[PDB]
Amino acid sequence: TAVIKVIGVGGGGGNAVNHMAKNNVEGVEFICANTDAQALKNIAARTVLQLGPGVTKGLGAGANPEVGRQAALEDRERISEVLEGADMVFITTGMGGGTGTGAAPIIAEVAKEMGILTVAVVTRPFPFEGRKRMQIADEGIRALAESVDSLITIPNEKLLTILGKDASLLAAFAKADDVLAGAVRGISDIIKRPGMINVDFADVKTVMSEMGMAMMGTGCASGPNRAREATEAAIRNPLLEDVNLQGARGILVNITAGPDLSLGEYSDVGNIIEQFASEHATVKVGTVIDADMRDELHVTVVATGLG
Amino acid sequence: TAVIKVIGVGGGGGNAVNHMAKNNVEGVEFICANTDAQALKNIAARTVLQLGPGVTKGLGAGANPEVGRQAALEDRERISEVLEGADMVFITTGMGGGTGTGAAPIIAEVAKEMGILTVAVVTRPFPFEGRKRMQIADEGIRALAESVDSLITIPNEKLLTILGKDASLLAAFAKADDVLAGAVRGISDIIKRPGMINVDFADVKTVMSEMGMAMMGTGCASGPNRAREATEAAIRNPLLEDVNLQGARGILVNITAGPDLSLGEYSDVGNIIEQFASEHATVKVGTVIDADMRDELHVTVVATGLG
Amino acid sequence: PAAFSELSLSGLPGHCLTLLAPILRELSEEQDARWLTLIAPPASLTHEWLRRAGLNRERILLLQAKDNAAALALSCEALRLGRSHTVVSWLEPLSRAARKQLSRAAQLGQAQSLNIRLG
Amino acid sequence: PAAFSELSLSGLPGHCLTLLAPILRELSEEQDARWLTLIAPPASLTHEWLRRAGLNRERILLLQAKDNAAALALSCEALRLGRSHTVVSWLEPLSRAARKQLSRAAQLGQAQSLNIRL
Ligand SMILES: Nc1nc2c(ncn2[C@@H]2O[C@H](COP(=O)(O)OP(=O)(O)O)[C@@H](O)[C@H]2O)c(=O)[nH]1
Ligand SMILES: Nc1nc2c(ncn2[C@@H]2O[C@H](COP(=O)(O)OP(=O)(O)O)[C@@H](O)[C@H]2O)c(=O)[nH]1
Numbered sequence: 127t128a129v130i131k132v133i134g135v136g137g138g139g140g141n142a143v144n145h146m147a148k149n150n151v152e153g154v155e156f157i158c159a160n161t162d163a164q165a166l167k168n169i170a171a172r173t174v175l176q177l178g179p180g181v182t183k184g185l186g187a188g189a190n191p192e193v194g195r196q197a198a199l200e201d202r203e204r205i206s207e208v209l210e211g212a213d214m215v216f217i218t219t220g221m222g223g224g225t226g227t228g229a230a231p232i233i234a235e236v237a238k239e240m241g242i243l244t245v246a247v248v249t250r251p252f253p254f255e256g257r258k259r260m261q262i263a264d265e266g267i268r269a270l271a272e273s274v275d276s277l278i279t280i281p282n283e284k285l286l287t288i289l290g291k292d293a294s295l296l297a298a299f300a301k302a303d304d305v306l307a308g309a310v311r312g313i314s315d316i317i318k319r320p321g322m323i324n325v326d327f328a329d330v331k332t333v334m335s336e337m338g339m340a341m342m343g344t345g346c347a348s349g350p351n352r353a354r355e356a357t358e359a360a361i362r363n364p365l366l367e368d369v370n371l372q373g374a375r376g377i378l379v380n381i382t383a384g385p386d387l388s389l390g391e392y393s394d395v396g397n398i399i400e401q402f403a404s405e406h407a408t409v410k411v412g413t414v415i416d417a418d419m420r421d422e423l424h425v426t427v428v429a430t431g432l433g
Numbered sequence: 434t435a436v437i438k439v440i441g442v443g444g445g446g447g448n449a450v451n452h453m454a455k456n457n458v459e460g461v462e463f464i465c466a467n468t469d470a471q472a473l474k475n476i477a478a479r480t481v482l483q484l485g486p487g488v489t490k491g492l493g494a495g496a497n498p499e500v501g502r503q504a505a506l507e508d509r510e511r512i513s514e515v516l517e518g519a520d521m522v523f524i525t526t527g528m529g530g531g532t533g534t535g536a537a538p539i540i541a542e543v544a545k546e547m548g549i550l551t552v553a554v555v556t557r558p559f560p561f562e563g564r565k566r567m568q569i570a571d572e573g574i575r576a577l578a579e580s581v582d583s584l585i586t587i588p589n590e591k592l593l594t595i596l597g598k599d600a601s602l603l604a605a606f607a608k609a610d611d612v613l614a615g616a617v618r619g620i621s622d623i624i625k626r627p628g629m630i631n632v633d634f635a636d637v638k639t640v641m642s643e644m645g646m647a648m649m650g651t652g653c654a655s656g657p658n659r660a661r662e663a664t665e666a667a668i669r670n671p672l673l674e675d676v677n678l679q680g681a682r683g684i685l686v687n688i689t690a691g692p693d694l695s696l697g698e699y700s701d702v703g704n705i706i707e708q709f710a711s712e713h714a715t716v717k718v719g720t721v722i723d724a725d726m727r728d729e730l731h732v733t734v735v736a737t738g739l740g
Numbered sequence: 741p742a743a744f745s746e747l748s749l750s751g752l753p754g755h756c757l758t759l760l761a762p763i764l765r766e767l768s769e770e771q772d773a774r775w776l777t778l779i780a781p782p783a784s785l786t787h788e789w790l791r792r793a794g795l796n797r798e799r800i801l802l803l804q805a806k807d808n809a810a811a812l813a814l815s816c817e818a819l820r821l822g823r824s825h826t827v828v829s830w831l832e833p834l835s836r837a838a839r840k841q842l843s844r845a846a847q848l849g850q851a852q853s854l855n856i857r858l859g
Numbered sequence: 860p861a862a863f864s865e866l867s868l869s870g871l872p873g874h875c876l877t878l879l880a881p882i883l884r885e886l887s888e889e890q891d892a893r894w895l896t897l898i899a900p901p902a903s904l905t906h907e908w909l910r911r912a913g914l915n916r917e918r919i920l921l922l923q924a925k926d927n928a929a930a931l932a933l934s935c936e937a938l939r940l941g942r943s944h945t946v947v948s949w950l951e952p953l954s955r956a957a958r959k960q961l962s963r964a965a966q967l968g969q970a971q972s973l974n975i976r977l
Pocket of ligand 1: 139190252
């Protein structure tokens with residue numbers, strides 16, 4: 127019955143949240159927080175939070191992170207209200223702009239002050255966006271890590287590897303939206319629609335709470351060796367390339383499959399994970415059964431407390 | 434399921450068996466074997482076996498054991514027919530006469546040849562019967578002991594003591610009948626009417642098979658400490674006086690009580706007994722619940738493999 | 741609270757027996773230091789089956805009865821005496837009256853009355 | 860032998876649950892290397908209750924369904940898939956044709972169908 131809220135901050139953050147509200151991310155409440163008043167009009171998210179109407183006058187920020195920060199400081203109270211009652215909050219944004227990089231850390235401070243488990247799921251700018259934005263993003267990320275339990279980072283640069291020849295400007299950000307949705311879905315589902323009884327909210331809190339930086343990888347496969355192929359594919363996902371899985375304090379695994387999931391497939395994923403996880407790590411493997419799913423098997427791995 | 438047959442040999446044995454048939458002692462087939470055709474007419478047992486029609490011509494053995502033996506030898510065949518199908522045989526007789534002391538050992542041999550568990554429960558003459566019978570009884574008990582798995586030799590002398598002033602010729606032999614019935618019933622109820630499932634026929638065999646000399650004591654009590662009282666009473670029963678429980682290879686214990694038997698009481702009995710038995714002795718404690726019994730708790734202890 | 745419960749098992753006889761085992765096994769191990777009393781169970785529940793079902797052989801009492809009417813009276817009595825944490829009956833039919841009788845007897849003995857129906 | 864079985868419990872709700880626990884606990888430990896699948900059990904059978912009930916946490920799948928009609932359909936599909944040694948349902952009422960469907964699915968999946976009526 128956990129109350130899970132997802133807040134998209136800024137332009138990119140809003141696009142990801144609206145993409146989540148349209149696809150398959152159930153059991154959560156969606157909120158879009160932005161200084162840009164026009165961007166909050168006619169959107170999927172049921173709740174909107176127009177940040178700093180006095181500092182920005184609804185005109186948005188100008189890619190200036192200070193404006194985003196000041197607008198958030200102005201609405202600490204309204205940020206509290208929109209978050210009231212959550213057992214968990216996902217903060218998603220595209221770091222590198224003004225609203226997202228500036229306001230997210232402040233929104234996180236509030237959530238933390240309220241004792242709410244907080245997981246940030248953000249992207250680092252694409253190399254084509256310039257050094258300036260990458261610098262801004264890095265700073266905002268550093269400020270963010272000071273108040274979130276787990277900070278999942280998605281370097282957009284890696285999305286280009288995944289996309290390959292299918293890359294285009296529209297497809298690149300569309301991919302970012304989808305990856306962010308997979309992160310929120312992978313975790314939220316373990317909490318809201320678990321198929322097994324071995325992982326409860328407390329177990330998730332244990333692998334997420336006060337962990338710091340995190341990263342994820344996803345994979346899916348069909349056929350006779352789908353369990354191993356999906357798991358290995360998640361491990362070698364470029365979004366998890368630069369991470370020493372054995373060096374992570376927490377490991378949350380989401381197995382999503384239809385009723386054709388066999389006991390052996392479940393143990394296969396567990397065995398593969400145990401081989402990469404450190405013995406000093408908290409490992410939780412939650413399972414989600416999609417009653418209408420068949421042949422495919424998805425594996426989502428979130429490595430927390432990296433380093 | 435186990436087929437249990439009781440064979441009373443001779444006059445006294447016939448009376449003992451007839452008493453058994455008119456009292457409790459359920460689940461067993463009664464047979465009176467005698468050379469005295471006249472004694473086989475007005476009895477309660479349903480099966481009779483006239484021993485040696487050709488030798489004694491149905492007139493009895495005249496107290497000469499040799500005649501009893503010759504009569505039994507004559508009907509070795511009819512004896513096997515009567516025992517056929519039995520899984521256990523109780524042979525009871527008053528040692529000291531002609532038929533019983535002479536035929537009992539032969540009947541035991543036949544039972545032994547057929548591989549039937551054989552338990553003999555017999556008495557030694559009362560001293561008021563004379564030296565001749567006592568001498569004859571001693572020789573017979575030696576012969577019998579060589580062909581039975583267990584041999585309970587009840588000395589009538591002890592019974593005359595237990596009776597005190599109520600002692601009369603008739604009362605004395607009635608007491609013997611009653612004690613004999615107690616031996617048979619105590620052991621057979623464990624096999625035929627177990628209230629618990631911890632002791633099966635195989636267990637009883639372990640305690641009874643090729644054991645040798647045996648003796649039994651009975652006790653009964655009512656009220657708050659009946660468990661301890663009945664057990665102590667069974668152990669201090671004069672029939673077990675000059676018997677060292679710690680020297681017995683096997684110990685079979687029958688607890689008989691009504692529906693008011695407590696789990697604690699069942700435990701006390703076994704505690705008191707394990708206290709007297711050696712760690713190397715095989716101890717079996719069977720429980721028989723008499724649906725319509727109340728307050729009274731009976732304990733029967735049979736020590737086998739004495740010495 | 742001490743009371744009356746009823747368990748019914750339907751299906752193939754062998755399936756009904758194997759599904760029964762874990763409950764009887766569990767009951768035989770009850771923390772309450774008293775007996776598990778089974779009253780007039782079907783011929784199928786032999787002492788051998790009970791031992792193979794892994795029941796605690798030192799905490800079970802199995803009593804017989806000539807017929808349903810006798811089993812009913814015996815059941816209430818064993819409950820009444822309060823020497824068993826649970827008295828298991830195999831009565832069918834069982835009237836609302838009989839159930840009340842079993843229930844009352846159970847309360848008096850601070851014990852549980854459990855009737856089982858197979859078929 | 861694959862088939863349909865039904866277990867019914869009458870009495871205080873708390874008593875019924877207590878009696879049911881040992882069955883589910885043992886079912887979750889079946890030697891058969893397959894799942895114990897529970898289909899839309901009553902609200903009283905929370906994940907917490909099943910854990911506190913001692914069931915093997917790594918060998919049970921719990922699938923929900925909006926109503927009896929859906930639960931019946933999901934039970935047969937689960938049985939049919941053959942991934943569970945036992946598929947436990949909590950369906951009442953249950954028609955003759957319904958039990959027939961369940962027993963056929965059980966045979967197809969070489970599994971056991973067990974319906975529980977509380
Ligand atoms: N997921 C996602 N990220 C985006 C999208 N557009 C831009 N971004 C990223 O998010 C960053 C922030 O830009 P923007 O959202 O415009 O900033 P803000 O509104 O001022 O916070 C950029 O540097 C991009 O990497 C989009 O449609 N989806
Ligand atoms: N239990 C019992 N023993 C008896 C009875 N009458 C005699 N005896 C004993 O059994 C012995 C054998 O005597 P009896 O049976 O007449 O001898 P048999 O028939 O020739 O073997 C006697 O020495 C007595 O001690 C009786 O009524 N009951």
